[PDB]
Design a protein around this ligand. Structure first.
Ligand SMILES: CC(=O)N[C@@H]1[C@@H](O)[C@@H](O)[C@@H](CO)O[C@H]1O
Ligand SMILES: *[C@@H]1O[C@H](CO)[C@@H](O)[C@H](O)[C@H]1NC(C)=O
Ligand SMILES: *[C@@H]1O[C@H](CO)[C@@H](O)[C@H](O)[C@H]1NC(C)=O
Ligand SMILES: *[C@@H]1O[C@H](CO)[C@@H](O)[C@H](O)[C@H]1NC(C)=O
Ligand SMILES: [Ca+2]
Ligand SMILES: [Ca+2]
Lengths: 149, 83, 83
């Protein structure tokens, strides 16, 4: 390629360096180099699904990320974590048992909440009252209880 | 639809056969939907004009039923694997 | 061949018995679903079933190719290699 890399930067956008084939060209971190082997382009990081968890804004050779008010951003610049001190609670429906699982730093605790449920099909929860709602197919009914049964 | 039924639209209409369960991601305003015949988990936007696959062409899914989300994790239940 | 790198291509394979590779694809047969499956050997990118549910548990699989194999000289072909 061009020995004139030294004279005119090889026509390259950012930087050209001499080599055995005359010209070599390079773009900095966050940039990308394309089919002409001379120009520089910007990685649109937000185009990658899940690059950062909640909000992403592209910038020249960089990115900016943000989390919603319920969440705090972590120190890395992409991850978001939840501000509330409460553990994750995961509720699953089996015909005879409303199973509940409690999560603590990737450790599990599994128990069965409510007695005398016949055939549970559907589940939801209300945060204002701190209650769990479920429906029973054999009873033909909908029930509400507290998260402690 | 609108929560009073006054507006109605169809947002996913193709590549869909036995769509079981729905979940929503509020920060991103995304809809998560799961299919038990084509055996996939996908997410789209509220208008259905951006669409992506989380799990697809994977034998892990046999008969998914229900879906939930937390942070960067997705939880689901399967009736074939009892899992 | 020395174990230097290790990766998982397909994360679920329903009790695979036999395996073969051709082109960009890896093929395997399993007892549980009575089927033959194709995947992409680098990523598991595209997964399909090459057969319907077969009436009996399938068995090992192999390939038939017209192109001549890799060739090299055999030390045994001169005077039985001294053996
Ligand atoms: C203002 C700002 O945050 N700049 C970011 C920088 O922090 C770093 O993440 C870089 C990664 O390529 O992208 C850009
Ligand atoms: C660069 O080349 C690839 C491969 O031919 C092509 O897919 C792509 O569209 C090209 N991009 C540009 C900007 O020419
Ligand atoms: C979940 O576990 C934590 C830690 O043991 C405990 O404080 C909390 O009460 C538990 N919540 C439920 C609903 O079990
Ligand atoms: C169950 O939770 C409710 C709501 O916090 C509380 O009023 C009640 O005392 C609790 N009961 C038990 C047995 O923990
Ligand atoms: Ca960028
Ligand atoms: Ca299925």
């Amino acid at each position: 390629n061009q020995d004139s890399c030294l004279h005119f930067n090889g026509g390259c956008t950012h930087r050209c360096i001499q080599g055995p084939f005359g010209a070599t060209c390079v773009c900095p971190i966050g940039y990308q180099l394309a089919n002409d082997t001379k120009t520089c382009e910007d990685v649109n990081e937000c185009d990658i699904p899940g690059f950062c968890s909640q909000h992403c804004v592209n910038m020249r050779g960089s990115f900016r990320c943000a989390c919603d008010p319920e969440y705090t951003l972590e120190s890395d610049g992409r991850t978001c974590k939840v501000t509330a001190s409460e553990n994750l609670l995961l509720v699953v429906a089996s015909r005879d048992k409303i199973i509940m699982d409690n999560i603590t730093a990737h450790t599990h605790n599994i128990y069965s909440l409510v007695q005398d449920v016949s055939f549970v099909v559907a589940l939801d929860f209300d945060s204002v009252t701190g209650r769990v709602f479920w429906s029973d197919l054999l009873e033909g009914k909908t029930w509400s209880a507290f998260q402690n049964g | 639809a609108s929560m009073d039924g006054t507006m109605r639209t169809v947002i996913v209409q193709e590549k869909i056969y036995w769509p079981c369960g729905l979940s929503i991601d509020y920060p991103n305003r995304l809809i998560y939907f799961m299919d038990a015949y084509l055996d996939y988990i996908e997410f789209c936007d509220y208008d259905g004009q951006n669409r992506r696959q989380v799990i697809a062409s994977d034998l892990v899914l046999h008969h998914p039923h229900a879906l939930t989300l937390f942070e960067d994790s997705v939880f689901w239940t399967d009736r074939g694997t009892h899992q | 061949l020395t174990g230097s790198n290790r990766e998982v291509v397909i994360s679920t394979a329903f009790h695979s018995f036999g395996l073969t590779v051709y082109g960009q694809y890896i093929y395997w047969t399993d007892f549980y679903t009575k089927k033959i499956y194709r995947a992409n050997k680098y990523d598991g990118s595209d997964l399909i079933a090459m057969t319907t549910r077969l009436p009996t548990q399938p068995s090992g699989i192999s390939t038939v190719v017209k192109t001549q194999q890799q060739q090299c000289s055999n030390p045994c072909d001169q005077f039985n290699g001294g053996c």
